[PDB]
């Protein structure tokens, strides 16, 4: 039984009980469904008291690393070919609800490693600039 546009809209309140271990999977499934609005019962406390506050900080660091990667791509005019693939992922999420995956720590480590190559590339650019300065001395001739 579903209701359409006839009168002051319909909604209901429900409490969802879930096991601790399957919390991430249940959250991913709900987000893929996107048919619920969880009441901010735990948000009455301050943000510094969030249960996933440290995980939030780790995700923020990963986001900063991704922003740095995007900045590098823009600085080198990368095509960002994964943009086409991202549309399928949004379509995949809207249709079939693909699993999120528990490899988030692996992506975090990969982001740190990508930042490592980013620093290496910056050092390489500095060395290239120094060599360009050195090449000026090569212009010296009798």
């Amino acid at each position: 039984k579903e209701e359409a546009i006839f009168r002051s809209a319909e909604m209901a309140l429900v409490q969802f009980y879930i096991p601790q271990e399957i919390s991430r999977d249940s959250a991913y499934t709900l987000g893929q469904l996107g048919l619920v609005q969880f009441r901010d019962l735990n948000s009455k406390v301050r943000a510094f008291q969030r249960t996933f506050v440290n995980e939030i900080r780790r995700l923020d660091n990963v986001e900063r690393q991704y922003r740095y990667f995007y900045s590098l791509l823009k600085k080198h005019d990368i095509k960002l070919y994964e943009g086409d693939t991202d549309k399928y992922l949004d379509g995949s999420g809207e249709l079939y609800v693909p699993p999120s995956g528990s490899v988030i720590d692996d992506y975090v480590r990969n982001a740190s490693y990508l930042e490592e190559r980013l620093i290496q590339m910056e050092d390489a650019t500095d060395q290239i600039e120094v060599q360009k300065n050195d090449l000026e001395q090569y212009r010296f001739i009798l």
Partner: peptide, 29 residues
């Protein structure tokens, strides 16, 4: 390296955003 990263940079960013949203929902939950 940049070209290889670009092959999955958008997908990785979308996954990171989804994980961040999940964590934010859990914190509010």
């Amino acid at each position: 390296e940049l070209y290889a990263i670009a092959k999955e940079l958008d997908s990785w960013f979308q996954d990171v955003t989804r994980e961040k949203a999940i964590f934010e929902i859990l914190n509010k939950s």
